[PDB]
Paper text:
[name] (Excision Repair Cross-Complementation Group 6 Like 2), also known as RAD26L and as the HElicase mutated in Bone Marrow Failure, HEBO24 is a poorly characterized member of the Sucrose Non-Fermenting 2 (SNF2) family of ATPases25 associated with a distinct bone marrow failure syndrome. [name] accumulates at centromeres and promotes deposition of core centromeric factors. Beyond centromeres, [name] facilitates replication at genomic repeats and non-canonical DNA structures. Notably, [name] interacts with the DNA-clamp [name] through an atypical peptide, presented here in a co-crystal structure.
Since the [name] aPIP-box peptide diverges from the canonical [name]-box sequence, we crystallized and determined its co-structure with [name]. The complex revealed a typical homo-trimeric association of [name] monomers, each with its own [name] aPIP-box peptide. The [name] aPIP-box peptide displayed some classical features observed with other [name]-binding peptides. It formed a 310 helical turn, constraining Leu801, Cys804, and Phe806 into a trident structure known as the “hydrophobic plug. This was critical for the efficient docking of the peptide into the hydrophobic pocket on the [name] surface. Binding to [name] was additionally supported by a network of electrostatic interactions, with the conserved glutamine residue Gln798 playing a key role. Despite the similarities between the [name] aPIP-box and other [name]-binding peptides in the basic configuration and the mode of binding, the [name] aPIP-box displayed two major idiosyncrasies. First, spacing of the hydrophobic residues in the [name] aPIP-box peptide did not conform to the conventional consensus Φ1-x-x-Φ2-Φ3. Instead, it included an additional residue and was identified by the Φ1-x-x-Φ2-x-Φ3 sequence. Second, a cysteine residue (Cys804) occupied one of the defining positions of the hydrophobic plug, which is unprecedented.
Author numbering:
A (entry chain F): 796 to 807
B (entry chain E): 1 to 93, 97 to 187, 191 to 255
C (entry chain A): 1 to 92, 97 to 186, 191 to 255
D (entry chain C): 1 to 185, 192 to 255
E (entry chain B), F (entry chain D): 797 to 807
């Protein structure tokens, strides 16, 4: 899955 | 008409050094309450939030709310022309004036920086409570991140109640760093957590964050399972500078 | 036979550090009265004039006048081999340099090759200046360095109570206003007729490399005439720089 | 099982800086008597010999003779993660292809474990021919380094002629020639000499040697007619770092 | 743009 | 004409 983005952690 | 007088001008110099490496261009939300800045970097992996309360200035006026789009690289380059003991005024009335008064009062410097038009885009910060909070000297956190970046690209952070561990692996080997909770001014290390947490982050971004080290003797790490890290530096009594960092799997 | 002993040898290091970037090669005129160096830069836009009076040394003998062509970059490279508190002897188709440590137990001897090149006789017209500004060499170095991050050219506006330095470029524009002070750290404006002139920051930044030689600097201007920047070496001489304006 | 604790850990930091620039990879002869390192450079003109006595360590245990092949560049990079006042432990386990390095912070509760990969090598067994010297010169390491850097800005090779009078260093080059004459007076210059000797050596290699200057305030030069120079720095009271340099005809 | 000293009376 | 250590009796 690698590095997540903040959009993948519930941010907008 | 916006005008803010900052006696200890080195703060502005340092704040922009803490931002330029991560954000090339951002939007300053000025109001009666102070200045406020939020932006993610290009890859949407981190978020930086700047807060400067108007009370921390020696003079502050703000008739209407403004939203100035500024090339931070340009504003950083202008602030490098300011001395460390200069008193710095930000002034606006599509140009941003910056006025640098030498301590003598016989030298005065006026810079007019062109502004840029940006898409205002509201960031949603989800609401979140953190299991683990680590408070530690900002200088050692910088050294930890810098050293492990010579070993690997990512750091594994394991917080237990009695200590925190930083680990990295790379082609020349691997290393880990263990800090224990102290029982001691601004070089103490205190952990307040609920139950063990382990997260993996990119050292690349962390070394951007630590460009804020001149702003504070301490740094605050906030963690929870599968949620972004927060590293926050407190600016003297005016506000803070928060960084959010999404984890790796 | 030429021989000159200089106790506070650091002067020479600072002098060449002030010349190497502007003049690649120059000709030293030695005489009974002292040392003198004049040269225009390659583009004929600036001129540097060096004066070192024989009285400023602690030994001096020059029975007859010389004309030494020296690669200044070559000579600079050698003088960085001298310590900062060392005593320097120049002796003279070769130019010897002798470096005496404080204790006189380490001693160094270098023989520099010279150049066969023609001594210049430059005609400087007689002039004196509407505005003369005297100010700390540090502040003026910083003024030039700061504005060079903004534009390639600086507009100097001298009025009676203040001097203004302006630049403009891609990322904006800047101004620095100096007022008359009221020590060693003073800023002095002496004005007859207001002047505004434009100069290339690149050459001014060459000039301010002479800053280690003096705590103050003197700026002299008039309408449509070259700027003069003068640093006074301790009591031995000076280093004058001329810079033609733009327009 | 090998384990060696070094309180003055800065020694290891300095020793590696003095070795990495000359030797890419080397073999540590570990034994009960201490640590030992020998290698010629690739071009076969110089040789470096390292001595660290077991008595010089706070703790030293060595169950069998070892021969650890170490990438010196990799090990220098790991030792750069150690502070200057850190306590450094070397540890080699049962079998393992790894050499552990442990950095103990002196003041606070911080400890760093690095695991370095090893490499297999056959130890070069080097024959040093048996030799005693006409001229022996002892002088401050700082002046010898500055002498070598200065003369390298003139030429590629330096002429050393000592008389019990004094020693002369000469170089000629593309812009002229220079010489430095040292007289007999930590701070001292001492000569003990026989028949006059004049030898020519490459300043390139000597400036590799003076990378060891931080290890000692003085250095010893050993010469005799037509034989390699020896440059030796005493390490604090545990050993030495010797360099051999063949002459030039 | 830039003048020379030779255009300012020097030799 | 730099000699090698093997040319000075070393091995």
């Amino acid at each position: 899955p690698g590095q997540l983005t903040l959009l993948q952690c519930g941010f907008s | 008409m916006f005008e803010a007088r900052l006696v200890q001008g080195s703060i502005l110099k340092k704040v922009l050094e803490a931002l330029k490496d991560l954000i090339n261009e951002a939007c300053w939300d000025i109001s009666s309450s102070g200045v406020n800045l939020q932006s993610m970097d290009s890859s949407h992996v981190s978020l930086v939030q700047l807060t400067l309360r108007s009370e921390g200035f020696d003079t502050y006026r703000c008739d209407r709310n403004l939203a100035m789009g500024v090339n931070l690289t340009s504003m950083s380059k202008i602030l490098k022309c300011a001395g460390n003991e200069d008193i710095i005024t930000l002034r606006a009335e599509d140009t941003l004036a910056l006025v640098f008064e030498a301590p003598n009062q016989e030298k005065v410097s006026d810079y007019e920086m062109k502004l840029m038009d940006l898409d205002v885009e509201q960031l949603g910060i989800p609401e979140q409570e953190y299991s683990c909070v680590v408070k530690m000297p900002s200088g050692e956190f910088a050294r930890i991140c810098r050293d492990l970046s010579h070993i690997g690209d990512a750091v594994v952070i394991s917080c237990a109640k009695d200590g925190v561990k930083f680990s990295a692996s790379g082609e020349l080997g691997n290393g880990n760093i263990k800090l224990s909770q102290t029982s001691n001014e601004e070089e103490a290390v205190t952990i307040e957590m609920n139950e063990p947490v382990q997260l993996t982050f990119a050292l690349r971004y962390l070394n951007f964050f630590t460009k804020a080290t001149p702003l504070s003797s301490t740094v605050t790490l906030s963690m929870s399972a599968d949620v972004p890290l927060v590293v926050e530096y407190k600016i003297a009594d005016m506000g803070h500078l928060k960084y959010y960092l999404a984890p790796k799997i």
